[PDB]
């Protein structure tokens, strides 16, 4: 992983460790802490800090949002690997490891999501004017990306994927919903909190959308060996275009995420 991105990710990790401190009841905060860091790191999150920089603002203005994004993603990951008795979800090969039982995972997931909103509502600094309107807008972007028409739609349709006979088109759509929308949400929020204007926000949203979808395809690439370089180049091309119009240091950085 590139040093700039790895460094940004480390900052989110620290900010999260400082925000969640194991305490009594340990039965509650232990799994809260563990499952937050047990989930994969997501670029939707670092993309938020980065997007903010690219448009001018300082990363610390987007830190709470970045943490909230990771948390929403983390609850979703926990719930999608949940051991289900009734065999309701096609037993995906994954079979990841589980430190806690299904009930504690389920509940902790339900606890993680509101913590993300709690940080956001609390990062409201008095010495900040446009604070309230942007945060509120970011809560909407985040609650939408982690809602029924966002990640949940991608998780739901993913259950219909049969490694056997399911098209690249259908898989790309699942990656777009499961990963793309959250990434689009992260770049958009970063832009929003930085202070950009609608035109920039949409461009960065769109870039996030394509990059996230591309990333999702990479992760599922190591599963359904069929990903022609065409799909990736397409997405890659689609992303860069959206950035065409941002010049500077970060411009090449953001550009490096897909390239």
């Amino acid at each position: 992983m590139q040093p700039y991105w790895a460094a940004i990710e480390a900052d989110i990790e620290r900010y999260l460790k400082k925000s969640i401190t194991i305490r009594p009841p340990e039965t509650v905060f232990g799994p809260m802490h563990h499952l937050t860091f047990a989930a994969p790191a997501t670029a939707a999150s670092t993309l938020c800090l980065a997007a903010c920089e690219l448009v001018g603002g300082d990363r610390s203005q987007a830190m709470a949002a970045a943490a909230a994004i990771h948390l929403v993603h983390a609850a979703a990951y926990v719930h999608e690997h949940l051991p289900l008795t009734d065999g309701s979800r096609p037993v995906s090969k994954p079979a990841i490891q589980h430190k806690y039982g299904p009930n504690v995972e389920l509940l902790t997931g339900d606890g993680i999501v509101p913590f993300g909103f709690e940080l956001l509502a609390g990062s409201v600094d008095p010495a900040r004017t446009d604070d309230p309107d942007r945060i509120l807008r970011v809560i909407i972007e985040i609650s939408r990306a982690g809602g029924p028409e966002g990640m949940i739609s991608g998780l739901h349709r993913e259950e219909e994927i049969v490694d056997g006979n399911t098209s690249l088109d259908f898989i790309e759509y699942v990656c777009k919903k499961k990963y793309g929308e959250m990434h689009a949400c992260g770049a958009a929020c970063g832009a929003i909190l930085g202070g950009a204007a609608e035109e920039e926000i949409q461009k960065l949203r769109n870039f996030g959308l394509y990059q996230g979808t591309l990333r999702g395809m990479m992760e599922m690439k190591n599963s359904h060996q069929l990903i022609d370089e065409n799909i990736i180049g397409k997405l890659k091309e689609l992303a860069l275009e959206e950035l065409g119009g941002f010049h500077g240091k970060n411009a090449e950085l953001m550009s490096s995420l897909v390239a």
Binding site: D169, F170, Y173
Partner: peptide, 19 residues
């Protein structure tokens, strides 16, 4: 073409169109 006919709900209808 790719941009005008994106995959969307109902997925089977759109998958068939793009196919």
């Amino acid at each position: 073409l790719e941009a005008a006919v994106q995959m969307k709900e109902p997925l089977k209808i759109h998958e068939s169109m793009r196919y």
